[PDB]
Design an enzyme around this catalytic site. Structure first.
Site, mmCIF file in Angstrom:
data_model
loop_
_atom_site.group_PDB
_atom_site.id
_atom_site.type_symbol
_atom_site.label_atom_id
_atom_site.label_comp_id
_atom_site.label_asym_id
_atom_site.label_seq_id
_atom_site.Cartn_x
_atom_site.Cartn_y
_atom_site.Cartn_z
ATOM 1 N N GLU A 3 -2.483 -8.939 2.572
ATOM 2 C CA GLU A 3 -1.883 -10.170 3.161
ATOM 3 C C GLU A 3 -2.895 -11.305 2.841
ATOM 4 O O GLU A 3 -2.499 -12.454 2.516
ATOM 5 C CB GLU A 3 -1.581 -10.082 4.666
ATOM 6 C CG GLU A 3 -0.487 -9.074 5.023
ATOM 7 C CD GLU A 3 0.937 -9.503 4.658
ATOM 8 O OE1 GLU A 3 1.115 -10.463 3.840
ATOM 9 O OE2 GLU A 3 1.896 -8.935 5.267
ATOM 10 N N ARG A 56 -2.222 -12.383 -0.752
ATOM 11 C CA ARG A 56 -1.026 -13.211 -0.807
ATOM 12 C C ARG A 56 -1.287 -14.652 -0.368
ATOM 13 O O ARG A 56 -0.888 -15.590 -1.058
ATOM 14 C CB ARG A 56 0.087 -12.598 0.047
ATOM 15 C CG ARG A 56 0.585 -11.253 -0.456
ATOM 16 C CD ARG A 56 1.447 -10.558 0.586
ATOM 17 N NE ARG A 56 1.941 -9.268 0.114
ATOM 18 C CZ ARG A 56 2.453 -8.329 0.904
ATOM 19 N NH1 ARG A 56 2.539 -8.535 2.211
ATOM 20 N NH2 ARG A 56 2.879 -7.185 0.388
ATOM 21 N N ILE A 105 0.889 -1.175 0.000
ATOM 22 C CA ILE A 105 0.000 0.000 0.000
ATOM 23 C C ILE A 105 0.926 1.224 0.000
ATOM 24 O O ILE A 105 1.978 1.227 0.693
ATOM 25 C CB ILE A 105 -0.963 -0.086 1.157
ATOM 26 C CG1 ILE A 105 -1.931 -1.226 0.867
ATOM 27 C CG2 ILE A 105 -1.587 1.243 1.440
ATOM 28 C CD1 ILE A 105 -2.962 -1.560 1.989
HETATM 29 O O1 LIG Z 1 6.936 -4.566 6.317
HETATM 30 C C1 LIG Z 1 5.597 -4.898 5.957
HETATM 31 C C2 LIG Z 1 5.100 -3.698 5.198
HETATM 32 O O2 LIG Z 1 6.053 -3.623 4.198
HETATM 33 C C3 LIG Z 1 6.199 -2.293 3.826
HETATM 34 O O3 LIG Z 1 7.416 -2.274 3.116
HETATM 35 C C4 LIG Z 1 8.411 -1.461 3.673
HETATM 36 C C5 LIG Z 1 9.726 -2.222 3.778
HETATM 37 O O4 LIG Z 1 9.583 -3.500 4.408
HETATM 38 C C6 LIG Z 1 10.779 -1.301 4.391
HETATM 39 O O5 LIG Z 1 12.068 -1.763 4.005
HETATM 40 C C7 LIG Z 1 10.718 0.126 3.861
HETATM 41 O O6 LIG Z 1 11.210 1.028 4.838
HETATM 42 O O7 LIG Z 1 9.414 0.575 3.505
HETATM 43 C C8 LIG Z 1 8.765 -0.371 2.718
HETATM 44 C C9 LIG Z 1 7.572 0.253 1.994
HETATM 45 O O8 LIG Z 1 8.137 0.821 0.822
HETATM 46 C C10 LIG Z 1 4.961 -2.000 2.958
HETATM 47 O O9 LIG Z 1 4.977 -0.614 2.634
HETATM 48 C C11 LIG Z 1 3.676 -2.450 3.671
HETATM 49 O O10 LIG Z 1 2.467 -2.374 2.853
HETATM 50 C C12 LIG Z 1 3.857 -3.799 4.391
HETATM 51 O O11 LIG Z 1 4.171 -4.843 3.505
#
Ligand SMILES: OC[C@H]1O[C@@H](O[C@H]2[C@H](O)[C@@H](O)[C@H](O)O[C@@H]2CO)[C@H](O)[C@@H](O)[C@H]1O
Ligand SMILES: *[C@@H]1O[C@H](CO)[C@@H](O[C@@H]2O[C@H](CO)[C@@H](O)[C@H](O)[C@H]2NC(C)=O)[C@H](O)[C@H]1NC(C)=O
Length: 246
Positions: A160, A163, A71
């Site tokens: 989720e 997925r 997102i």
């Molecule tokens: O961590 C679950 C969360 O993931 C986000 O992803 C993060 C990523 O893990 C981190 O390395 C970075 O700082 O930001 C990312 C987003 O660009 C997702 O944004 C979120 O939807 C969940 O999947």
């Protein structure tokens, strides 16, 4: 676009929304029969718009990165909101340009940062369809501490669930009553990326994982996934994160 309404929502219409959410994601290859998400997509086509309607019929539009199901941010009436992260900042050049302001939330979308912002780990946040109704309602009027928790609900009940079939099933059980996610649910969430990697790597290793994955199972037991015959691969996972993004 895809779109889910909470009014009249039951396990059936939720499942159908989650089916549409998976089918909106584009892919050109399946790996052991699992749609493989693109290494990348360019411009506006990188972004899926989900229209979500709360029980009263109010709506937010959520922008989803089709390459990873992250997102990016959402549109609530005339204000757009995006995580504090480069990807979301990129996303904001293509989605909801006509919003009256744009607010950048004071955290990234990472589960760790969202948990700090919310002041409670995912383990203690009830989820379900009623919880998704609360969360839509929250995100309608800015409030960053409340949004941290509304977004943690939202990620889990959409992304989720798309997925993993198991987590879609966990939500469908909670159609009318929220409940903290099972440990297995946290386990899969946390393992999505390693599973995606090891599914892709199995494919010239005769479906054997190079590195096994440790999960917790539905009965709370620690279990180890070593190849593609496991139920996790055969039934559970529905979308794979490309190794070109891992
Ligand atoms: O961590 C679950 C969360 O993931 C986000 O992803 C993060 C990523 O893990 C981190 O390395 C970075 O700082 O930001 C990312 C987003 O660009 C997702 O944004 C979120 O939807 C969940 O999947
Ligand atoms: C691939 O993983 C499967 C498990 O899904 C392995 O078969 C399991 O492993 C041992 C027996 O070798 C038992 O603990 C499980 O009960 C087995 N389960 C089933 C359903 O058969 C299999 O050995 C792995 N493949 C290789 C080559 O190691």
């Amino acid at each position: 676009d895809v779109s889910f309404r909470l009014s009249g929502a039951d396990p059936s219409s939720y499942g159908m929304f989650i089916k549409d959410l998976r089918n909106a994601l584009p892919h050109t290859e399946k790996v052991y029969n699992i749609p493989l998400l693109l290494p990348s997509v360019s411009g506006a086509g990188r972004y899926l718009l989900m229209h979500l309607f709360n029980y009263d019929g109010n709506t937010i539009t959520v922008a989803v990165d089709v390459t990873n199901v992250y997102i990016m941010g959402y549109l609530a009436l005339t204000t757009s909101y995006f995580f504090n992260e480069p990807a979301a900042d990129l996303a904001s050049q293509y989605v909801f340009r006509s919003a009256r302001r744009k607010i950048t939330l004071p955290y990234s979308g990472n589960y760790e940062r969202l948990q700090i912002a919310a002041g409670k780990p995912r383990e203690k946040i009830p989820i379900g369809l009623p919880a998704l109704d609360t969360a839509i309602s929250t995100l309608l009027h800015y409030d960053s501490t409340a949004a941290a928790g509304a977004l943690l609900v939202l990620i889990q009940t959409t992304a989720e669930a798309a997925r993993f079939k198991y987590i879609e099933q966990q939500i469908q059980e909670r159609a009318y009553r929220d409940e903290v996610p099972s440990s297995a649910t946290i386990s899969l969430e946390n393992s999505w990326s390693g599973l995606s990697k090891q599914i892709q790597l199995a494919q010239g290793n005769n479906g054997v994982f190079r590195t096994p994955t440790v999960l917790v199972d539905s009965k709370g037991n620690r279990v180890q996934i070593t190849n593609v015959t496991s139920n996790v691969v055969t039934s559970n996972i529905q979308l794979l994160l490309n190794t070109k993004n891992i």
